[model samples]
Target: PMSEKQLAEVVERTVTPLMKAQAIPGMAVAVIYEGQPHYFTFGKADVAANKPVTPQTLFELGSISKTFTGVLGGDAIARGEISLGDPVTKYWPELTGKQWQGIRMLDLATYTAGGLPLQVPDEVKDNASLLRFYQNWQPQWKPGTTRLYANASIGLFGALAVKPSGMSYEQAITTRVFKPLKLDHTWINVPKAEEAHYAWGYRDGKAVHVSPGMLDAEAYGVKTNVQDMASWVMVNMKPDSLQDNSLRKGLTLAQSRYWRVGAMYQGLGWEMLNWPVDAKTVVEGSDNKVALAPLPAREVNPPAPPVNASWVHKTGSTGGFGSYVAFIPEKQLGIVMLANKSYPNPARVEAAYRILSAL
Candidate 1:
């Protein structure tokens, strides 16, 4: 509903104040409005050397990596390799526990397979531990009972998602989606060659930068420039290209809302937002009753469906970096914000709302 120029003005006015206030060292914001793209880089991408943020500078894209995993899910379905409802045991036969065997793959992606913890303590100590943990973990509830935003739970969608496609999630996504989409700057693993351009993530109040770790690669491992990210926003805002692929099927899988995550709803690998907000409310009600309202149709999803002013949003936080991506499908306006200094503050999502509400 807002013009691209108008929206950009709003972003500048809103974000610059925060920048001046020293809230963050620098930020890169990208937008795709009405299928056209715009990106804004403010402050320093790297502070010590005084590098100005530019469209080409790479920034960590946190939990937004789940959206990439969603594509892996889409590609799997497009190839007719697997259905969303298939049980996890289909490809992961070594999952020695009976509970995990019965849990559906779709449930893991959607966060609906009842009561799974967000992360296991010692089990995820390293890659070997994660694999061992998966082999031993069992479902705590019936599939699709409650919503638990677990990184370890969705992280394996990368490994397990390949069951139907035969290609690893990395290869499947790179060949089927990234290459075709012309997104050369985006990557899961940040190789040594790219380190010069790499903007290390920072902690909120500390001087230290974050180290690349499992969550960085497994769930929020994507490193990309504002230019490539803007293209991704274009894909979501205009579904024409997305609607046509085997990846689309997986996207559809991720888009399917199977769980009741309060204030946020879950579809395969994506999270749906629908809830009422007011000046008094800082966030959507993350519980059942308040999340459901202003219904236009019978509930296709579980009770407490997200509000109509919805966008698919995901957030990522590491020791030093915090990141977010938000897109409103109906308006075709999206936001991508990557910051160098990461405090515990959820700055990106908050900034997005300020931009949206201003519009």
Candidate 2:
């Protein structure tokens, strides 16, 4: 185990320089070491205000929100509300069409819905329009044959996910997911009262927030603090702390592998790969450009069953913010990085790998 002194030293040696080189205005990180949480921050939440980032500083989680969407879907499944194999139209009748007929609910959640585009079309101005777009859309490939990372698909999954909970998607996630996990500082939309903790994300030196668009909650709409995020990692490390059987089962389903394409294993909303893997490969595989590419479909390799060693991770970005979260369940270890400026994925992984390696 790494001493607290050594961990802090590594943060200063790596994170400080990375922030300076990237011109990141602010960032926060949390680590789970031997089941205890440690917090660190760098730079200013508002460069002009000179406010320091802290454990309570809220950063946009971007697509890391998909992981929560995945768990919400899992919770629905655990409640006998939906099945993975069910067609998406089962809940979202608006999606009933030739192209959508073959797309299963699991396909949308897993990003294997046969080449759905990366984003909702610009013409889709609202929820109804977005649903109508899916109704008329056509897949470039057969369903379940390719793994094209798509916000539209997962966003649709979020829409369909709320059917069984007898609540709006946001309400369902709040009561069933956030409330159960005690994530008071985690939200798809930061409330007015909590706005003070929200950090200003920067792009090219100017502060900004995510654009107003359709399906914000499903794809990349989470805003959270380091303390709440650290609590999240600890739950993954020790799921029994959840106590609720339904939520526990939901998390299990969320984290379990659904499809594997080469080195990448799709786990509901999370990304999984063989443990002891190289950091570069993990970063490159999850890069936005690579995920957006229409790569040839490959055979699905199911995760090796009942392994003592494996890693689950996800990377998320908006116009200004970038975030990464990863964990090794067997080691009871995890890392979370939140930044105001969008930095390269490889560098984030390299920095996180160093911290994890130390433990």
Candidate 3:
């Protein structure tokens, strides 16, 4: 129902005030529908340099990066490289004989690891301190009993995914996911030549990008352009868009592993809700209380009955940049929004909802 021209008008109307009100200097948006892709760009990639944001300009994905970590783990499981029931200790024997020993790989991957903090802790500056942090870890409840969205939990899952490669977290993702997906412009570390296209993130009237943090490469350190990310979204919405391979199987497996948390379903990296949802519903489904606070988690026992429609999505942010990705597989619709400024999650959801409703 949405023509290319109509979609462009809707996005322009939606983003014009959206950016002016938030002081965002740059933005890139990608929409996929009807077996085609469309892009809309606005403002500047660098305000001072007067460079415009394009579909190919790199913007940080922030915690959207976590989805890669989850997918890699799922891919490993798909290829018989690992199993969900396996103990996390299988990857890090250093965590053996400690409180973390009882944690299953599935628990860590799903953010239900008995309440690991949202971060790995400032004291953990390197491997040795990280080792001590896990050795002294404490659990608030049994695995799978609670849903506490935490980077440390997924970060540990990612740590395991790359352990067998004996390579940096970035390298593992590149070799397994990026390479197979043909996402050439994506990276955890922006290379020399691509640096010029990397947009400067802004907040508090200052320019910034992500700073290094422990396990950040696996947790919240992906930089990509809208074009590559839309391709990523395309594969997620249409699994057949990718060939029959472990990578495709892995993406399906990642989405299949869902746990009920509040009013939403928690997949490995994506937060999901039944489709034909409202802007208010999306905002509440992705509210901080749901994402950052601990809540009861109930594992779906049998295979879930097919829903007529669904809205699968994730939101990501750094101190400066903010992003949101959502897709409706039944409708063959998906969207990616990247901005050079950090704004409230509700604003992001509302704008995206308005744009999608324009269809």
Candidate 4:
């Protein structure tokens, strides 16, 4: 087992130079090993003021918000409110018709819903407008045949997953996902009460805060602290860590491998692969550029049950900030990296793998 001191040294040796080399304004890292938590902070949360980052310092989670959405959707499923196999039109009748046929909730949840673009078009302003856009959308390929990483697909999945519970998407996520997990410092919008904790992501000597884009809350809207994120990793490592039975079941389903995308297995919100696996494979699969390029429709199938040493990971970025999370369940090891300036995926994957390997 790696000592806490050793892990702290690992962070200093492995991560500090990367922050300096990348000109990242600030970063917070948390590692959980055998159920114990360790935190390391570097740089300034506010570059101008020179305030240091802490466990309580908040940073944008970017696309990691999708993992939260997946958790909520899983909760809704466990509650008997919805099923992955159900067509999205079942919840929102406005989506009915030939265009919507064959697009199961599973397809949207796994980014296999034909070829919805990476985002909701700018012209789609309101709920009615979004519904209209879906009504007219034509699938480029048959649903369930491709692995296109479109926010429009999962954003719609998040919206419909919560609708059956008679709660708004944000409300359902807060109540069912965050509240149960005791993630008090995580939010789609940083509450005014806690605005002081929100760190600014800097670029070109100016703060570049993320705008609330289309499907903001559902896609890449979460702002969170290192401590809360450590709790999140803990829950994934051991679901019984949460007292509520339903929430436990929800987390179980949330982490389950639902589909295969190349060498990576798709969890509800995170990506899964066996650990001690190639860091290059994980990095390539989660590359930001892949989100833009069209991908050939690959064969699809449900993954086998996760083994003890399996790796569960995800990467997220806004224009200014970046976040990466990876954990090995049976090993009880995990790492979270949050930075003010956007950085590459290979660094995150490599750093995480090195640290976890040491543990």
- TM-score on alpha carbons, each prediction: 0.83, 0.95, 0.95, 0.94
What shift in Å separates residue 20 of candidate 4 from its native position after superposition? Answer: 1.9
What is the C-alpha lDDT profile of model 2 across 244-319, one tens digit per residue? 7878878777777677676867777887778988877876776657766766545345423323366878788888
| Model 1 / residue 176 / CA error / Å | 2.0
Scored against the true structure, residue 231 in model 2 reaches a CA lDDT of 88
Q: List residue ranges in candidate 4 displaced over 4 A.
A: 289-303
**Residue range 118-208, candidate 4, lDDT tens digits:** 8888887888888888888888888878878878988888988888788988789898889877899999888899988889987666887
Model 2 residue runs over 4 Å out of place are 296-308
Candidate 2 backbone collisions, by pair: none
How far off is model 1, as Cα RMSD?
Answer: 4.7
Task: Give Cα distance to truth, residue 287, candidate 3, Å.
Answer: 2.5
lDDT-better candidate, 2 vs 4: 4
Ranking by lDDT: 3, 4, 2, 1
Tell me how candidate 2 scores on lDDT: 0.82
Off by over 4 Å in 3: 302-308
Ordered list by TM-score, greatest first: 3, 2, 4, 1
Q: Candidate 1 — which residues are off by over 4 angstroms?
A: 1-6, 20-22, 120-128, 138-140, 204-216, 275-309, 343-346
The per-model lDDT (C-alpha) reads 0.64, 0.82, 0.83, 0.82
Task: Write one digit per residue (lDDT tens) for candidate 3, span 1-359.
Answer: 46678889988999999999988898899988764679999999998899999988999998899878878887887778888788888888877655676688888888887988888887788998888887787889887789888888898888887777667777879999998889999998999977999999998888899988888877888999999999888887877677788888788776773588766777778767888886777876666765577888888764253342778788888888999988888888888999989888778888888888777
Clashes of each: 17, 0, 1, 0
